[PDB]
Amino acid sequence: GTSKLKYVLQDARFFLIKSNNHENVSLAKAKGVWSTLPVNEKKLNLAFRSARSVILIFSVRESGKFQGFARLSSESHHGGSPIHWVLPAGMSAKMLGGVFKIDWICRRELPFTKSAHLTNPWNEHKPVKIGRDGQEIELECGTQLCLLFPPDESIDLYQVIHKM
Ligand SMILES: CNC(=O)c1cc(-c2ccco2)[nH]n1
16 A cells, blocks of 8 residues: 555655666665765755655666665765775766665656656756756655555565654
8 A cells, every 4th residue: 555655755855866877776775775976965964854754766867767766764974884886987986985874665667758747846847857866856746756656565664664
């Protein structure tokens, strides 16, 4: 069902995450971690203290789909054992030093063709698929986008609900 999922999304904040490659989303799904540019890291740290849930919605560039979504379970931290991210052409590993712990809520994909009716007021009401890495998605758009994903029956939201 969808009732526990709606409870987790209640009064959440939502951020679009754009990855240049599938390898980093696969690593994030396996290890429960994410890293982003410092500008976005500052935004996520602010949001994590401000809201009951901060939701990251993942899209690999050029894939035409979202690959799932996850809830922040910590602010960023540095100095842990380094994660072997695949780094884009012109950026170093010091940029992605801040590591967030995340709990996956859905590891299933959603094609952009299924979200074409949802627009993001915080990006000029462009379709929600459009936006830079770190773009915040307004509450109603973000909630409806998450509810479009196929249910992930492998995930038990009971443990996430406790962290809230
Ligand atoms: C593990 N984290 C990443 O792979 C990543 C990449 C980017 C990015 C922003 C702009 C171009 O690439 N943001 N996060």
